[PDB]
Amino acid sequence: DDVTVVYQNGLPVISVRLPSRRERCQFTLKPISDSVGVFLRQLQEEDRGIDRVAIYSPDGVRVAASTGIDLLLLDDFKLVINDLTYHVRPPKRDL
Numbered sequence: 001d002d003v004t005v006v007y008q009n010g011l012p013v014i015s016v017r018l019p020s021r022r023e024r025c026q027f028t029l030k031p032i033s034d035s036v037g038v039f040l041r042q043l044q045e046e047d048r049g050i051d052r053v054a055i056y057s058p059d060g061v062r063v064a065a066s067t068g069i070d071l072l073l074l075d076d077f078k079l080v081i082n083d084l085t086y087h088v089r090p091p092k093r094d095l
């Protein structure tokens with residue numbers, strides 16, 4: 001029902017339900033070279049129904065697109081997809 005972050009084979013896998021279908025979709029990311037912007041672009045490419053997507057800190061401050069996925073996953077964040085906000089809780093990993 002929500003957005004999960006699970007490490008598989010050493011890499012974070014973010015799983016989400018996208019608005020156009022029920023089938024959940026997963027996004028494996030490279031912490032040290034992918035950015036927030038890359039992930040958001042992948043989401044948009046996956047579902048044309050997505051009009052708006054953005055990531056925010058738990059305090060509701062927008063997270064810069066250039067920020068590395070490793071940094072994003074140091075703490076909780078919010079992922080907004082159209083009119084829904086997901087509270088995402090990554091497992092804490094040093095770095």
Ligand SMILES: [Mg+2]
Pocket residue numbers: 058075076
């Ligand atoms: Mg915190």
